[PDB]
Amino acid sequence: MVNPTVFFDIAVDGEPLGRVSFELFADKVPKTAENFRALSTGEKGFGYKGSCFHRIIPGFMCQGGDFTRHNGTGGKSIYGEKFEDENFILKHTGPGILSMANAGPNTNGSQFFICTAKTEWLDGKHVVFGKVKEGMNIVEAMERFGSRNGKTSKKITIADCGQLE
Amino acid sequence: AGPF
């Protein structure tokens, strides 16, 4: 079939930093992929546009998607406040992997993370549903603004986002 | 929300 492709235009303290596009594996994780896609277009009203990456740990991952509380404690899916873990077919095999952040089994909302390294210990706990297609260097560049505990030195936000294909 |  055809997997959706979405993009994120990143900005640091307002200054445009570049674009990152993802391939969502709708063929294997349809519901999870649809959720991310819809949140990227903003077709349901709420979405990712304007939200920031509140947690960046260099060498581990970049986390964002909490557009309601902006600190990892909020966010919601197009299915409600949270949906079940669709499946664990895909694994965290390396940099670029797009996975779902959560606070335990079946607590998927809108938060996600982009891996900047192989994080095998997350397999079976977080649903992998896509991967970076283009702009991986933009993701690595974002690490420059993170810290060991995740606190970011600058305001990293999703200036704009949408669907390409 | 994790990951830990």
What topology emerges from the helices and strands here?
The complex is a heterodimer of chains A (about 160) and B (about 5).
Chain A: E1 5-12, E2 15-24, H1 30-41, E3 55-57, E4 61-64, E5 97-100, E6 112-115, E7 128-134, H2 136-142, E8 156-163
Antiparallel strand pairs in A: 1-2, 1-8, 2-7, 3-4, 4-6, 5-6, 5-7
Chain B: no helix or strand
How does this model look, in words?
The complex is a heterodimer of chains A (165) and B (4). With 165 residues, chain A is mainly β. Chain A has one domain (1-165): Cyclophilin-like (Cyclophilin). Chain A has helices spanning 30-41, 136-142, and strands spanning 5-12, 15-24, 55-57, 61-64, 97-100, 112-115, 128-134, 156-163. In chain A, strands 3-4-6-5-7-2-1-8 form an eight-stranded antiparallel β-sheet. The longest helix of chain A is centred in the N-terminal third of the chain and has 12 residues, at 30-41. In chain A, 41% of the residues are buried. Chain B is low in regular secondary structure. Helix content of chain B is 0%, strand content 0%. The radius of gyration of chain B is 3 Å and the shape is elongated. The chains are: A mainly beta (165), B little secondary structure (4). The A-B interface holds A 61, 63, 66, 72-73, 75, 99, 101-103, 107, 109, 111, 113, 119, 122, 125-126 and B 1-3.
Gyration radius of chain A, to the nearest Å?
Answer: 14 Å
Helical run tally of chain A: 2
Assign the CATH topology of chain A.
Cyclophilin
Domain module tally of chain A: 1
Note the beta-strand portion of chain A: 25-35%
Major sheet of chain A: size, sense and barrel closure?
8 strands, antiparallel
For the record, the CATH architecture of chain A stands as Beta Barrel
Tell me the overall shape of chain B. Answer: elongated
Neighbour order of strands in the largest sheet of chain A: 3-4-6-5-7-2-1-8
User: Largest interface, and how many residues on either side?
Assistant: A-B, 18 and 3 residues
Number of strands of chain A: 8
Residues in helix, % of chain A = 10-25%
Structural class of chain B: little secondary structure
Strands of chain B, count:
0
CATH superfamily of chain A: Cyclophilin-like
The helix tally of chain B amounts to 0
- SS strand fraction of chain B: under 5%
Query: What is the radius of gyration of chain B computed over CA atoms, rounded to a whole number of angstroms?
Result: 3 Å
- Give the overall shape of chain A, derived from the CA principal axes: globular
GO molecular function (chain A): cyclosporin A binding; heparan sulfate binding; integrin binding; peptidyl-prolyl cis-trans isomerase activity; RNA binding; unfolded protein binding; virion binding
Family (chain A): Belongs to the cyclophilin-type PPIase family. PPIase A subfamily.
Enzyme class (chain A): isomerase
Main location (chain A): cytoplasm
